[PDB]
Write a protein that binds this ligand. Structure first.
Ligand SMILES: CCOC(=O)C(=O)Nc1cccc(C)c1
Lengths: 237, 300
């Protein structure tokens, strides 16, 4: 069924599973026309499909050409997401196929279920977790690949860099969600925290800086302070 | 006009005949129902006074044989039987008619209600939904499950309605996932009408039979089937105009006949609101929308 805090360790067991977040698939800027009406202009998007145990991120770049001449784009975007996730599953060897796909938004349930009818043994589930995966486009290297794309493209990343050499996937996922929540809540402040120190860099093959264990504790504390600070600003607390 | 003779009425029982009903007392001198209109299927149904559990009954057509009801004290119910000896049958019916031991089917001349509810219902199709080949009539009861219910348990005692499932490979062509899920026309026209039912008359017959089993027996699986067959049409962008107009008539008479006090258990709010106000056919069922809004505005 649905996935929440009671069955949270389930994310890190040995049953292959993927989170699918469609929040960045269909992206627009809204602007006034010469006649004073309003129009949208689509910009490139992406599907965020993540294995929370391994950190493997299947980033399908959604080029704006896929919307050309199409109607009801916000509805189409859900079905396009389901089509692409289904195509990904079919492209994987059987022993790499997920046993569960967890969608971050309940509106993805029917599109994905319908596209996956050929896979009756893959459970399609919602979650009661509020996951900050919309902030994926605040990760500079992911944003760059999405905005530079001139055609549909799939790019594979490990969103945990090399952290699993030193920490469990439970801890890695917790770190990831803290970082993304901070980037979602105050992107400039979060990026300042992550990059303020010039002596700590991002390896060419990584997404995040090369913090030592003790530095990660400091960073994590600064991110929690940011989130709490923004909560106080928001609610006048 | 034909007749269904009762050996006797040893237990107090409410008897239905089509949309009519009457009470018989324990051991009352009742010997059946006369003046049954030739040309339609009929249903004779029972609810015991001392045990309202199991409504049950028999669909039949007097053109297919001579049928009589006898109470079975072992199985505890009124059973329909066929009498092969026609002269015997005529002699027994004549005696009970002469002694005025029978109720008369009370059809008003103005009244097309039963025709309107059974226009497309034929005994031959009933006997394929209800499988008991040795009898020319068909037993149904409150508790019988459908083939679809038994997939989601005795298969011999099931209602073999056509399985409709909107999230099934049958309903969704590979490569047409969004199209087929949002517009059921493929599933209605190619799979169901051209493929399974062969024509709209057979589709409407099953829909009408499902409604009648829902209403007369409180059969839950039948109510599910009726709603599914409605929703399949309403959720299709492309439906022949004659089908939409006929569906409006079919539903109008069904809603007209439904007992008001059973509307909470016989009508699915989600399906009706979707069909009348959101679906492709929201503006195609003018008669049904008008009666629904005037009779059951709470549901909407
Ligand atoms: C046990 C054999 O019994 C019968 O054959 C029988 O009851 N026939 C019948 C025919 C018409 C009317 C009624 C009331 C009975």
């Amino acid at each position: 069924g649905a996935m929440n805090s009671s069955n949270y360790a389930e994310l890190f067991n040995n049953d292959i599973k993927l989170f699918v977040d469609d929040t960045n698939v269909y992206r627009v800027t809204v602007h006034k026309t010469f006649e004073g009406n309003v129009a949208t202009k689509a910009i490139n998007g992406c599907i965020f499909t993540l294995n929370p145990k391994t950190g493997h991120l299947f980033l399908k770049i959604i080029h704006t050409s896929v919307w050309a001449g199409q109607k009801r784009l916000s509805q189409l975007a859900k079905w396009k997401t389901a089509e692409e996730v289904s195509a990904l599953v079919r492209s994987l060897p059987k022993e790499e196929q997920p046993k569960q796909i967890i969608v971050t938004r309940k509106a993805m349930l029917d599109p994905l279920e319908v596209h996956m009818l050929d896979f009756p043994n893959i459970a399609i589930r919602p979650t009661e977790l509020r996951l900050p995966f919309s902030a994926a486009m605040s990760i500079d290297k992911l944003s760059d690949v999405v905005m530079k794309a001139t055609e549909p493209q799939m790019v594979l990343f490990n969103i945990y860099d090399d952290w699993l050499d030193r920490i469990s996937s439970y801890t890695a996922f917790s770190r990831l969600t803290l970082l993304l929540r901070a980037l979602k809540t105050n992107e400039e402040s979060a990026k300042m925290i992550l990059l303020s120190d010039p002596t700590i860099t991002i390896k060419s093959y990584h997404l995040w800086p090369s913090f030592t264990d003790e530095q990660w504790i400091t960073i994590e504390s600064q991110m929690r302070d940011l989130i709490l600070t923004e909560y106080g600003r928001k609610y006048n607390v | 006009m034909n007749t269904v003779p009762f050996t006797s009425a040893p237990i107090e029982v409410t008897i239905g005949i089509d949309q009519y009903s009457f009470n018989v007392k324990e051991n009352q001198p009742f010997h059946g129902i006369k003046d049954i209109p030739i040309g339609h299927v009929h249903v004779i149904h029972f609810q015991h006074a001392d045990n309202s559990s199991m409504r049950y009954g028999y669909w039949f057509d007097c053109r297919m044989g001579n049928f009589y009801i006898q109470y079975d004290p072992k199985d505890g119910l009124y059973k329909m039987m066929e009498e092969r000896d026609g002269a015997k049958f005529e002699n027994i019916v004549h005696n009970f008619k002469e002694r005025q031991m029978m109720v008369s089917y009370p059809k008003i001349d103005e009244d097309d209600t039963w025709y309107n509810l059974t226009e497309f219902v034929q005994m031959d199709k009933i006997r394929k939904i209800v499988r008991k080949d040795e009898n020319q009539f068909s037993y149904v009861d409150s508790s019988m499950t459908t083939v679809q219910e038994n997939e989601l348990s005795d298969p011999a005692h099931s209602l073999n309605y056509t399985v409709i499932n909107f999230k099934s490979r049958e309903a969704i062509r590979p490569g047409h996932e969004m199209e087929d899920f949002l517009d059921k026309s493929y599933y209605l026209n190619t799979v169901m009408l051209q493929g399974i039912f062969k024509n709209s008359s057979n589709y409407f017959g099953e829909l009408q039979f499902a409604f009648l089993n829902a209403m007369f027996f409180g059969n839950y699986g039948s109510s599910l089937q009726w709603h599914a067959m409605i929703e399949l049409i309403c959720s299709s962008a492309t439906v022949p105009k004659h089908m939409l107009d006929k569906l409006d008539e079919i539903l109008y008479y069904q809603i007209k006949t439904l007992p008001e006090q059973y509307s909470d258990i016989l009508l699915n709010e989600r399906v009706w609101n979707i069909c009348l106000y959101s679906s492709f056919q929201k503006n195609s069922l003018h008669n049904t929308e008008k009666i629904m809004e005037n009779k059951y505005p709470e549901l909407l």
